[PDB]
Design an enzyme around this catalytic site. Sequence first.
Site, mmCIF file in Angstrom:
data_model
loop_
_atom_site.group_PDB
_atom_site.id
_atom_site.type_symbol
_atom_site.label_atom_id
_atom_site.label_comp_id
_atom_site.label_asym_id
_atom_site.label_seq_id
_atom_site.Cartn_x
_atom_site.Cartn_y
_atom_site.Cartn_z
ATOM 1 N N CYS A 255 19.160 42.987 73.883
ATOM 2 C CA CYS A 255 18.286 44.338 73.588
ATOM 3 C C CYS A 255 19.058 45.503 72.909
ATOM 4 C CB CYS A 255 17.373 44.645 74.642
ATOM 5 S SG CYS A 255 18.592 45.022 76.507
ATOM 6 N N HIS B 276 16.976 47.859 80.481
ATOM 7 C CA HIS B 276 16.536 47.529 78.967
ATOM 8 C C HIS B 276 16.433 48.526 78.032
ATOM 9 C CE1 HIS B 276 14.421 45.045 76.510
ATOM 10 N NE2 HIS B 276 13.402 45.735 76.435
ATOM 11 N N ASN C 123 9.750 47.316 71.105
ATOM 12 C CA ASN C 123 10.475 46.333 71.754
ATOM 13 C C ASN C 123 11.152 45.288 70.767
ATOM 14 O OD1 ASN C 123 11.486 45.266 73.933
ATOM 15 N ND2 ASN C 123 9.436 44.945 75.006
HETATM 16 C C1 LIG Z 1 18.322 43.905 77.555
HETATM 17 O O1 LIG Z 1 17.329 44.669 78.275
HETATM 18 C C2 LIG Z 1 17.659 42.598 76.987
HETATM 19 O O2 LIG Z 1 18.210 41.915 76.337
HETATM 20 N N1 LIG Z 1 16.586 42.255 77.517
HETATM 21 C C3 LIG Z 1 16.187 41.061 77.661
HETATM 22 C C4 LIG Z 1 14.509 40.854 78.249
HETATM 23 C C5 LIG Z 1 16.607 39.692 78.091
HETATM 24 C C6 LIG Z 1 17.566 39.772 79.185
HETATM 25 C C7 LIG Z 1 18.226 38.712 79.529
HETATM 26 C C8 LIG Z 1 18.231 37.508 78.711
HETATM 27 C C9 LIG Z 1 17.492 37.570 77.331
HETATM 28 C C10 LIG Z 1 16.646 38.612 77.279
HETATM 29 C C11 LIG Z 1 19.838 43.819 78.033
HETATM 30 C C12 LIG Z 1 19.781 42.771 79.162
HETATM 31 C C13 LIG Z 1 21.106 42.312 79.662
HETATM 32 C C14 LIG Z 1 21.000 41.452 80.931
HETATM 33 C C15 LIG Z 1 21.979 40.279 80.774
HETATM 34 N N2 LIG Z 1 19.935 44.656 78.714
HETATM 35 C C16 LIG Z 1 20.856 45.656 78.353
HETATM 36 O O3 LIG Z 1 21.982 45.492 77.592
HETATM 37 O O4 LIG Z 1 20.901 46.899 79.173
HETATM 38 C C17 LIG Z 1 22.113 47.771 78.956
HETATM 39 C C18 LIG Z 1 23.208 47.266 79.961
HETATM 40 N N3 LIG Z 1 22.940 48.255 80.934
HETATM 41 C C19 LIG Z 1 23.740 48.292 82.209
HETATM 42 O O5 LIG Z 1 24.725 47.197 82.317
HETATM 43 N N4 LIG Z 1 23.160 48.842 83.106
HETATM 44 C C20 LIG Z 1 23.360 48.544 84.556
HETATM 45 C C21 LIG Z 1 22.660 47.638 85.135
HETATM 46 C C22 LIG Z 1 21.393 46.644 84.838
HETATM 47 N N5 LIG Z 1 22.808 47.427 86.603
HETATM 48 O O6 LIG Z 1 23.858 48.522 86.542
HETATM 49 C C23 LIG Z 1 24.047 49.113 85.360
HETATM 50 C C24 LIG Z 1 25.036 50.426 85.329
HETATM 51 C C25 LIG Z 1 21.914 49.348 80.533
HETATM 52 C C26 LIG Z 1 21.465 49.296 79.366
HETATM 53 C C27 LIG Z 1 20.086 49.279 79.257
HETATM 54 C C28 LIG Z 1 22.379 50.334 78.625
#
Ligand SMILES: *[C@@](O)(C(=O)N[C@H](C)c1ccccc1)[C@H](CCCC)NC(=O)O[C@@H]1CN(C(=O)Nc2c(C)noc2C)CC1(C)C
Length: 215
Positions: free
Chosen positions: A25, A162, A182
Amino acid sequence: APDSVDYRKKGYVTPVKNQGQCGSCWAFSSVGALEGQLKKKTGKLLNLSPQNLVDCVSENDGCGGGYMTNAFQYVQKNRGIDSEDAYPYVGQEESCMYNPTGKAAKCRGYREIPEGNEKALKRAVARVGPVSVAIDASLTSFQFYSKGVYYDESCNSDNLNHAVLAVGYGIQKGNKHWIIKNSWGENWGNKGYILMARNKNNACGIANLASFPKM
Ligand SMILES: *[C@@](O)(C(=O)N[C@H](C)c1ccccc1)[C@H](CCCC)NC(=O)O[C@@H]1CN(C(=O)Nc2c(C)noc2C)CC1(C)C
């Protein structure tokens, strides 16, 4: 700043993409912001490569997540990002294979919106164009969203999980909103889009981690 603006109607936004089963994402969010800045600078709208970012941003975690600012920093240092065609999306992590002949845009830095300031985010969207944002999209209500202005009291502004793209803002029948692109395909939400509550105490943490690239 205007009361309402929609950059989709200005030709700043590419079609909605489908990230598939890869946590990328953040790459789609980054590419979206870069695509808008490319349109503003050159007059042309084209798809840039999320895969380029997944594979090559070493300070991010590929299909396991990442930060948009790290992606903007990479594009700057690398002095370029490929188009979608020169580095197509396959939804899995592979070794970095940046192709300099396919370069379609650059980055000259990034700037950040003051944490939680929804008025500063409005002014940035109005002045700059599409802005990368981070939200709590964990709720079942977000997953099945169809139409209207999205608001859920159990959304947590501390739980940013996300990455999406704010392509504008407006007011739908009295309700202030952000226009949100999205990356789950055109069959999710409203043709790939969601309207999210604006000026409702930073709902889902919409203004907590917002940034845009410079060109
Ligand atoms: C992202 O939302 C995404 O790709 N979502 C879709 C639905 C998806 C998820 C999993 C598999 C397939 C599709 C992505 C998801 C990564 C999870 C594996 N989100 C993302 O990169 O969010 C980034 C990373 N963040 C982060 O690490 N923040 C965080 C969390 C979740 N817990 O503690 C912390 C500090 C935040 C951010 C949105 C920048």
